[PDB]
Enzyme design. Structure first.
Site, PDB file in Angstrom:
ATOM      1  CE  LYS A 200      -1.942   1.055   3.714  1.00  0.00           C
ATOM      2  NZ  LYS A 200      -2.131   2.963   3.998  1.00  0.00           N
ATOM      3  CG  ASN A 201       1.818   2.950   3.155  1.00  0.00           C
ATOM      4  OD1 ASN A 201       0.574   3.440   2.590  1.00  0.00           O
ATOM      5  ND2 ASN A 201       1.900   2.670   4.813  1.00  0.00           N
TER       6      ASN A 201
ATOM      7  CB  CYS B 201      -4.675  11.843  11.862  1.00  0.00           C
ATOM      8  SG  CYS B 201      -4.009   9.832  11.562  1.00  0.00           S
TER       9      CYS B 201
ATOM     10  NE  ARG C  76      -0.113  11.384  10.015  1.00  0.00           N
ATOM     11  CZ  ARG C  76       0.153   9.803   9.146  1.00  0.00           C
ATOM     12  NH1 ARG C  76      -1.009   9.510   9.824  1.00  0.00           N
ATOM     13  NH2 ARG C  76       0.618   9.477   8.149  1.00  0.00           N
TER      14      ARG C  76
ATOM     15  CG  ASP D  49       3.009   1.549   9.337  1.00  0.00           C
ATOM     16  OD1 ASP D  49       2.983   2.133   8.775  1.00  0.00           O
ATOM     17  OD2 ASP D  49       2.613   2.730  10.378  1.00  0.00           O
TER      18      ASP D  49
ATOM     19  NE  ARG E 249      -6.980   4.248   5.756  1.00  0.00           N
ATOM     20  CZ  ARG E 249      -6.638   5.480   6.087  1.00  0.00           C
ATOM     21  NH1 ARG E 249      -6.931   6.445   7.270  1.00  0.00           N
ATOM     22  NH2 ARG E 249      -5.848   6.287   5.149  1.00  0.00           N
TER      23      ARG E 249
HETATM   24  C1  LIG Z   1       1.231   7.144   2.835  1.00  0.00           C
HETATM   25  C2  LIG Z   1       2.548   6.538   3.644  1.00  0.00           C
HETATM   26  O1  LIG Z   1       3.081   5.333   3.186  1.00  0.00           O
HETATM   27  N1  LIG Z   1       2.040   6.447   5.086  1.00  0.00           N
HETATM   28  C3  LIG Z   1       3.562   5.945   5.813  1.00  0.00           C
HETATM   29  C4  LIG Z   1       3.627   7.113   5.998  1.00  0.00           C
HETATM   30  O2  LIG Z   1       3.592   8.117   6.664  1.00  0.00           O
HETATM   31  P1  LIG Z   1       4.391   9.997   6.972  1.00  0.00           P
HETATM   32  O3  LIG Z   1       3.151  10.423   7.230  1.00  0.00           O
HETATM   33  O4  LIG Z   1       4.756  10.114   5.222  1.00  0.00           O
HETATM   34  O5  LIG Z   1       4.767   9.773   8.097  1.00  0.00           O
HETATM   35  P2  LIG Z   1       6.559  10.885   7.626  1.00  0.00           P
HETATM   36  O6  LIG Z   1       5.893  11.686   7.265  1.00  0.00           O
HETATM   37  O7  LIG Z   1       7.598   9.874   7.763  1.00  0.00           O
HETATM   38  O8  LIG Z   1       6.250  11.004   9.609  1.00  0.00           O
HETATM   39  C5  LIG Z   1       6.698  10.872  10.779  1.00  0.00           C
HETATM   40  C6  LIG Z   1       6.836  10.788  11.705  1.00  0.00           C
HETATM   41  O9  LIG Z   1       6.919  13.123  11.333  1.00  0.00           O
HETATM   42  C7  LIG Z   1       6.400  14.279  11.184  1.00  0.00           C
HETATM   43  N2  LIG Z   1       6.334  14.719  10.601  1.00  0.00           N
HETATM   44  C8  LIG Z   1       6.219  14.578   9.126  1.00  0.00           C
HETATM   45  C9  LIG Z   1       6.035  15.260   8.190  1.00  0.00           C
HETATM   46  C10 LIG Z   1       6.453  17.095   7.907  1.00  0.00           C
HETATM   47  O10 LIG Z   1       6.393  16.941   7.666  1.00  0.00           O
HETATM   48  N3  LIG Z   1       7.163  17.250   9.872  1.00  0.00           N
HETATM   49  C11 LIG Z   1       6.598  16.298  10.628  1.00  0.00           C
HETATM   50  O11 LIG Z   1       6.601  16.840  12.139  1.00  0.00           O
HETATM   51  C12 LIG Z   1       4.873  13.325  11.372  1.00  0.00           C
HETATM   52  O12 LIG Z   1       3.835  13.930  12.017  1.00  0.00           O
HETATM   53  C13 LIG Z   1       5.130  11.768  12.485  1.00  0.00           C
HETATM   54  O13 LIG Z   1       5.632  12.112  14.638  1.00  0.00           O
HETATM   55  O14 LIG Z   1       5.290   6.746   7.209  1.00  0.00           O
HETATM   56  C14 LIG Z   1       5.006   5.905   8.681  1.00  0.00           C
HETATM   57  C15 LIG Z   1       5.914   5.690   9.509  1.00  0.00           C
HETATM   58  O15 LIG Z   1       6.575   4.924   8.608  1.00  0.00           O
HETATM   59  C16 LIG Z   1       3.581   5.639   8.183  1.00  0.00           C
HETATM   60  O16 LIG Z   1       2.721   5.066   9.250  1.00  0.00           O
HETATM   61  C17 LIG Z   1       2.147   5.358   6.978  1.00  0.00           C
HETATM   62  O17 LIG Z   1       1.717   4.379   7.652  1.00  0.00           O
HETATM   63  C18 LIG Z   1       0.578   5.413   7.546  1.00  0.00           C
HETATM   64  C19 LIG Z   1       0.284   5.135   8.469  1.00  0.00           C
HETATM   65  C20 LIG Z   1      -0.320   4.767   6.389  1.00  0.00           C
HETATM   66  O18 LIG Z   1      -0.570   3.359   6.176  1.00  0.00           O
HETATM   67  O19 LIG Z   1      -2.039   5.424   6.361  1.00  0.00           O
END
Ligand SMILES: CC(=O)N[C@H]1[C@@H](OP(=O)(O)OP(=O)(O)OC[C@H]2O[C@@H](n3ccc(=O)[nH]c3=O)[C@H](O)[C@@H]2O)O[C@H](CO)[C@@H](O)[C@@H]1O[C@H](C)C(=O)O
Ligand SMILES: CC(=O)N[C@H]1[C@@H](OP(=O)(O)OP(=O)(O)OC[C@H]2O[C@@H](n3ccc(=O)[nH]c3=O)[C@H](O)[C@@H]2O)O[C@H](CO)[C@@H](O)[C@@H]1O[C@H](C)C(=O)O
Ligand SMILES: CC(=O)N[C@H]1[C@@H](OP(=O)(O)OP(=O)(O)OC[C@H]2O[C@@H](n3ccc(=O)[nH]c3=O)[C@H](O)[C@@H]2O)O[C@H](CO)[C@@H](O)[C@@H]1O[C@H](C)C(=O)O
Ligand SMILES: CC(=O)N[C@H]1[C@@H](OP(=O)(O)OP(=O)(O)OC[C@H]2O[C@@H](n3ccc(=O)[nH]c3=O)[C@H](O)[C@@H]2O)O[C@H](CO)[C@@H](O)[C@@H]1O[C@H](C)C(=O)O
Lengths: 416, 416, 416, 416
Positions: free
Chosen positions: A22-23, A116, A121, A304, A396
């Site tokens: 998915k991701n 969320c 996030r 995850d 989902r």
């Molecule tokens: C679509 C997808 O791939 N989604 C995945 C991806 O989310 P993402 O959003 O990209 O993850 P991050 O940006 O690495 O987020 C990690 C951390 O970094 C903070 N952050 C992120 C971006 C930003 O600009 N500012 C900022 O502060 C954020 O708040 C978090 O605390 O990576 C996550 C971590 O492995 C997964 O849990 C998530 O899966 C999900 C559940 C699913 O399948 O729905």
């Protein structure tokens, strides 16, 4: 409304085929927007999140067709670079179109994601990178607009190795003038999949998988055919299920390189694991040994799989500590686990799991995708019967979890 | 007792030569113990921490000579694999001999480090790796003993990418039977320096700098000659000093690859930086722009520069947030900064720095190495005169900070 | 589905009458179950949470009638001491029947509450107190059962001064044999209201409002008539609204003793406040001064006003820090505030609010009761128009917020 | 240098007399400065912290004499309202003179305390209250100066119920014009002792012990005689020692009202406790039951007994969680406990203690007063012999711990 009913099950035994990630597919679908032409994505899982982002591409004017795990996108004729609130509210991964649309059209206006369940996030690092590339950013009534007369490659540092920011910035940089360098990039396997796809379309992206990504922008990208990597998170879910049910499961169509911390931690808990070229065999132990887990950016332990390991730990032979560094409030499931007789106490980002004799079936609600799957795992080992509500969370992101667990011998049914 | 007196100084201007890395030389000195033979380390900084670990090697029976930045070690005839409490209490980096001694002699007994000012700093992951290699671990009255009939290479996962655990395990694995794989390894530049040294001695260590290290054990290692990398933390200190004093400084004998987040963040704060092959020029801005920093494993922002960036932020034009993910209690300096008129509020691992017009000189105490250096930085910009006590903290890890800052135009003196 | 539409409004001006306290009436309604007889509660707010717990009393067999802000309960003939999952899932305050039912019938079986948006909210201290009084506790498939041959008064210590545990234990102790002493009791005004009601029924409860409550059990309690105290949280909401809109509002039918930290903090932010016997006047300042808030047990700053103060701070003239000590994850609203142009960064339990020029209207969702009300406050000051979804959260606990704000001059409408 | 040597001891048995409260006498000594006249304090413990603040009173010009547990102060002729850096650096409780000096002389200049081992300990709420009373505050080179043409009583809210801020503000308000109201006051027993003393001198202070203190200022106060309350923290230390050694100890000259959470928690751990009018008997259990503790403002569990309970928990029969809400970094002792074979893991403000079979003696260092005493407790139960360094920490605040434990049968000696 609809429920998943799980009963105390036999040790799971057999083979399970893992679907496409998915991701990986979600950012790769957004990337199709970068090409004036038709792309072909194979190994696309038949999942709601897939259909949501596909409907977003339709909104902006790409042509999309899905059948039999193949999705094609013709992004020859795009008609708008605006992603409206209703679509982004459905799924914050919709934000991943911003980088490609900015890159193709030098202007894009995308609703800013709101709250969320699993935490606050922000998308500040995405905007940071776009600004580094020459884009001017403004906010209008919940929308973020990024526009430039031209994108110019630049070096930029990510304060956290955000998966999404790495993706979005890599895609924007792919058509920029000159060379972009992403420092402290996410190293997640999906980053490598995306990069590979961009390179398949004609891009020049090097270092994906490492802490530094260099993109040398090109003038135009062309539609390409791509085989998405396997879902490492789904695979991990079935691995944990073998661990928890004292089962013996062969998980098929996986890449062991992408599962390293899960394999390691499961072995530490007492699993016997046999790693093969395209499959892995997991034999659950007779007594689960308590272990501690700490979620981190890849190749650290994945957030995850945190809920699912916590569920395993509820019946481990001792005390385990689970520390979530990646998301704030990714403990909503704890209260649900406790309704099933778990002994879990949280403070801050740490949860102390004091293993119990057995869980007991109860009515529970999925709070999010991965926790809902953890609840099914609990349901497999909990005495009696477990009824899980709010099952859309699960559906989902898992293909036919009922069918796959049933084929492994488990007692599970979706009722409407 | 001894004090460092700093006065409000002119913009710093000129060139400063950076010494060899303290935190490369300390594990590399421990590694010399792996070879039956004589090693030669060049570019060794003349620092107390160096002399402490050298005295530890003498204790175990290696011959050591230091002159003119060259240290030689002949570890041909080792007489004991026990590191007593008095030595380890002086400096917890002494623990880094455990891996080599275990590897050479299959038994070693090392005092377990106690409390440290900057946090509770367990060594559980070091022991985890040794156990993975076949060692049996026991505790005797504050000592940890590791022993094996033979070390055997194995795969092992680090729950956090600990610098010290990566080092210790790499050194132990270097003489093990078979292949060791360190998953989720520290990527810090010192890991790469150490690896290079081990390979210079005859080892087979690949992937240092990446998230996975593979060591193929060899039967014997031989003394080798090694040039230690520059001190990236010292370099960062002088860079921040240019930033804070609105100076213009060329930092000499550095590796820009090792300074990436510091360069990035300083540019974000408004510095003009010119990166060259062996030097970097930093011009401070007229107004410091507030930035946020978040410490992380390399190549994220280094914890060893956190206090010094916080000091810069005390007079930035707005609000900056400093988040320490790597060490618990690495905020002891905040109260000292506040005595100089800063406006800093902490909760948990985050400090909110609300920039003020100027600091004002005051009597302060160094709490640790890097914070003591931050206090000198404050002293440079604080109105009047700043007196810093407990200066041994600083002298541990900076070569002649008084002389180097004086050569850049600053007003600083050590008084006894 | 239904939305609240708020537009940029004029300074609010006028009088608002405050309804009876939701969080006094909910435990007091549960307490009616202690009496073989008919109680009469006046000043009962016409709220969903009220109707939910009333339906729970009906389930167990009490007779309930509600009209015109008076609720009567005849608990003469109770038919079951079991609170089923469906009812408790609706509202975790349903748990408050456990103490009275245990006390009346020496056995009760209550579904254990699951997850809640604002945090993991265990009920361990309730069970702790019941066990101290002689009850044996067991878990059956999501239910908690407490039973005793007889309740005996005992001393017990609350590890946190839980509102709900204080209430539940006070009610159980009211019919116990002998004297119960609750050490480190909640001091919230609702604790005092409940105590007063129990004493009205014939109980002997002393020290409510202080850190120690002593209950001397009686054999039987009789139905009584009670006037519920005003809603201090509602009152606070209107006070903040005056502050944020630079308004001038008289809040009627309140008790100033119950509003102390809110008054203090609003004055610190620059409000002019005039405290009267049954009313308080709040005049908003021309410039909001930034302040820090830290939620704590009463009489510290209330968690139920945290979101609303945070909303005020989004446009304060500087930097404010909001620290939530009482609930884990009570920051879900931050992302919604940021969609309206706020500048808020969270780590751990602290949120740094960097004041902006003005908010801008946007589509937002209420995440919980008090945050939904904060969103209405933002909507009043945000340029243009704000649309708020998931409005059931708000309607749970505010009587006619649309009508009351409209009567103060605001532009607000509920659309279906 | 000096060490405390503790050996594995017999169950402690006998009586121990508790000295006067260090933390009552320190603010009460500062309060003597409010009277033009001679005060007489009885039950003053013979402790370094006492002597330090006495030397501060001498500095400002009060006459002080100490003998045989009686301290007299004649504050008729004060010669300066400035507390210099050298004195305040010795002990941050010196800050408690600021309120009285401000009140007597309408001007005072006090060095701002710097870092402390147990955390960043700002004094912002002290200054908040002084400002509320009419004082203008300025910072000069590490000093804080407060001055007013006249102090005027006002209402003020404490964002946290700080012990020190409550004390300082109560003392300042005692000579102010009009009525001061401290909302959300500390309720600690020492607050009540101080109040009583002020009232003995002629003040009008009501509500000490409750969440609101009202002071009606008077024109002049006169020297008075006062009997200080017993040291509840010392008493708790001996109580825990009985618990840990499976002893049977009567602690003499105590007030049970001041020990409530310690009594409760010790009973929960399995102690048999007999509370008497002026003494308490503690019989340790055969098996310690694991309990959780959470430090909080009085009458919650005291932070000053946290290390000592953690030490008890190291050998409890299971898993206990210790949560420190009051101080940041009050876990420095954990690494020392782990050197003695404990199993303690920390994250954030929580420590997970996984009970072990027995501790083993080792060389350890006291990190602070209360932790040093916890180390002596460990030393009593640890197999073999424990050597504790940095013993000045302990001697600061315990009268003759060696003599008192020796009289209970323990094996302890101070060596120089
Ligand atoms: C679509 C997808 O791939 N989604 C995945 C991806 O989310 P993402 O959003 O990209 O993850 P991050 O940006 O690495 O987020 C990690 C951390 O970094 C903070 N952050 C992120 C971006 C930003 O600009 N500012 C900022 O502060 C954020 O708040 C978090 O605390 O990576 C996550 C971590 O492995 C997964 O849990 C998530 O899966 C999900 C559940 C699913 O399948 O729905
Ligand atoms: C000699 C040397 O190189 N020391 C440096 C090295 O320490 P190290 O100790 O190896 O660092 P870690 O193991 O990566 O420690 C990082 C984090 O990981 C936890 N952890 C570490 C090991 C373990 O087994 N278990 C475990 O939990 C640990 O508690 C910390 O929170 O790396 C640190 C981080 O960059 C530096 O601050 C440190 O410099 C210092 C100041 C100096 O110059 O004196
Ligand atoms: C019905 C009612 O009055 N509800 C209110 C009451 O909840 P309550 O549940 O009683 O509050 P707590 O027990 O004092 O909870 C405070 C903290 O204590 C932890 N805790 C509580 C109980 C227990 O056994 N174990 C335990 O750990 C708990 O998790 C929390 O972190 O008090 C809260 C605090 O002021 C309010 O926010 C809440 O209002 C709400 C929103 C509304 O109107 O719906
Ligand atoms: C002399 C004396 O009585 N000292 C005691 C007193 O310190 P105090 O300093 O008054 O305690 P606080 O003000 O209640 O401090 C509690 C918390 O509040 C924060 N805070 C305090 C004041 C302020 O203005 N701003 C602010 O933020 C503070 O940082 C801490 O986190 O109370 C503490 C708590 O019980 C004790 O641990 C302490 O004992 C000691 C060890 C000993 O014997 O030496």
């Amino acid at each position: 409304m609809a429920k998943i009913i799980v009963k105390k099950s036999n040790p799971l035994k057999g083979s399970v085929k893992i679907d496409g990630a998915k991701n990986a597919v979600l950012p790769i679908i957004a990337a199709t927007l970068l090409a004036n032409g038709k792309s072909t994505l194979n190994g696309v899982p038949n999942l709601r999140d897939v259909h949501v982002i596909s409907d977003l591409l339709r909104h902006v004017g790409a042509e999309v067709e899905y059948k039999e795990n193949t999705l094609t996108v013709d992004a020859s004729n795009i008609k708008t670079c605006e992603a409206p609130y209703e679509l982004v509210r459905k799924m914050r991964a919709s934000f991943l179109v911003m980088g490609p649309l900015l890159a193709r059209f030098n202007s894009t206006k995308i609703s800013m994601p709101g709250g969320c369940a699993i935490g606050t996030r922000p998308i500040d690092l995405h905007l940071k990178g776009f600004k580094a590339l020459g884009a001017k950013i403004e906010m209008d009534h919940g929308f973020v607009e990024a526009a430039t007369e031209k994108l110019v490659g630049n070096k930029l540092y990510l304060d956290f190795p955000s998966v999404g920011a790495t993706e979005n910035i890599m895609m924007a940089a792919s058509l920029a003038e000159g060379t972009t360098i992403i420092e402290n990039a996410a190293e997640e396997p999906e980053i490598v999949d995306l990069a590979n796809f961009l390179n398949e379309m004609g891009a020049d992206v090097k270092g994906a998988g490492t802490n530094t990504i260099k993109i040398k922008g090109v003038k135009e990208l062309k539609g390409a055919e791509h085989n998405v990597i396997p879902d490492r998170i789904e695979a991990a879910t079935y691995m944990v299920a073998a661990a928890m049910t004292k089962g013996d499961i062969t998980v098929e169509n996986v890449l062991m390189e992408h599962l390293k911390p899960v394999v390691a931690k499961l072995r530490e808990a007492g699993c016997e694991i046999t790693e093969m070229d395209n499959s892995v065999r997991v034999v659950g132990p007779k007594v689960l040994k308590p272990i501690d887990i700490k979620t981190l950016p890849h190749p650290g332990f994945p957030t995850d799989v945190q809920a699912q390991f916590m569920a395993m730990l509820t019946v481990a032979n001792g005390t385990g500590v689970v520390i979530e560094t990646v998301f704030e409030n990714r403990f909503m499931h704890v209260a649900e686990f406790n309704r099933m007789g778990a002994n879990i106490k949280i403070d801050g980002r740490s949860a102390v799991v004091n293993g119990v004799d057995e869980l007991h079936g109860a009515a529970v609600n999925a709070t999010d995708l991965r926790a809902g799957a953890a609840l099914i795992l609990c349901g497999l080992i909990a005495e009696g019967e477990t009824q899980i509500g709010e099952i859309y969370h699960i559906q989902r992101g898992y293909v036919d979890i009922d069918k796959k667990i049933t084929a492994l011998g488990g007692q599970i049914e979706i009722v409407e």
